[PDB]
Amino acid sequence: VSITKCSSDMNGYCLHGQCIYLVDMSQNYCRCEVGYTGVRCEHFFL
């Protein structure tokens, strides 16, 4: 369990989800809303 939140000008990928940051894999980790139809929270299938 090692992750962090995001800052400003950093929300341009995940629209429906929380922004996070992987420390073991220094990269942008955005958790989408459980219920979307893509691994990028953008189009709601339901």
Provide the residue ranges of all domains of the chain, joining segments of one domain with +: 1-46
Q: Report d(CA 15, CA 33) in Å as an integer.
A: 9
Q: Report d(CA 5, CA 21) in Å as an integer.
A: 6
Q: How many CA atoms lie within 13 A of 24 on its CB side?
A: 2
DSSP classification of residue 13: S
DSSP classification of residue 9: T
Secondary-structure class of domain 1-46 per CATH:
mainly beta
First to last CA, the chain: 31
Strand ranges for the chain from DSSP E: 3-4, 17-22, 27-32
Q: What does the longest C-alpha to C-alpha distance in the chain come to?
A: 33
Is residue 15 within 8 A of residue 36, CB to CB? The reply is no
Q: Report d(CA 13, CA 38) in Å as an integer.
A: 12
Is residue 27 within 8 A of residue 7, CB to CB? The reply is no
Is residue 41 within 8 A of residue 30, CB to CB? The reply is yes
Q: Report d(CA 24, CA 17) in Å as an integer.
A: 21
